[PDB]
Protein: Glycoside hydrolase
Amino acid sequence: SQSLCAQYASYTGSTYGLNNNLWGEASGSGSQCTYLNSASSSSINWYTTWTWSGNANEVKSYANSQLLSFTKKYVSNIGSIPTTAQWSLSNTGVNADVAYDLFTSSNINHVTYSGDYELMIWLGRYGSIQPIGSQIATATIAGYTWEVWYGGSSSQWTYSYVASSPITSFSGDIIDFFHDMTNNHGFPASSQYLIDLQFGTEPFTGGPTTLTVSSWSASVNLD
Structure:
């Protein structure tokens, strides 16, 4: 039932971590704590409460649960990345996304907070915020239709798959998004290690609001 309120307060479980991760706090005024409900080998259940004001265009944080227990492999060598997210947001009158964040790198010892590539999956978008880059496609994946956004620079390309209306109860295989990137956008799966897998929320402004993640899970399975 632990409380993570400091800027970088974290919990390290056997399989999952939880991070308050107020990385952009200097960008505005407010407050945010993240709370472990429970963590097991099967899943993690948590919530985060926040109020942020100022610099409407700057992300203030990315509180997240994180899969700690997986081997870094080339994306081409990953058979499946099954994941589930069951969540709700108590106050929708905010500017925020609710999103998976993944990074890949050719360098297996790359910092895990960025990469050569970034894949985000926005399960929920509140307020007229948009991913990095521009929308370049639409795709049907995991039984839903996504706007496919792409942008960044040479040092990091970000693919964002964006749900129109919130998917508060999600199950899918993240590898299908990688496949989409590989088959349709030339993503170099066989020379990029999956180095990070998180789920959480990027607040811009609004609140108080609470994101409750009653259940989150992921694993990275080899063939």
Notes: The two ends are 36 Å apart (CA to CA).
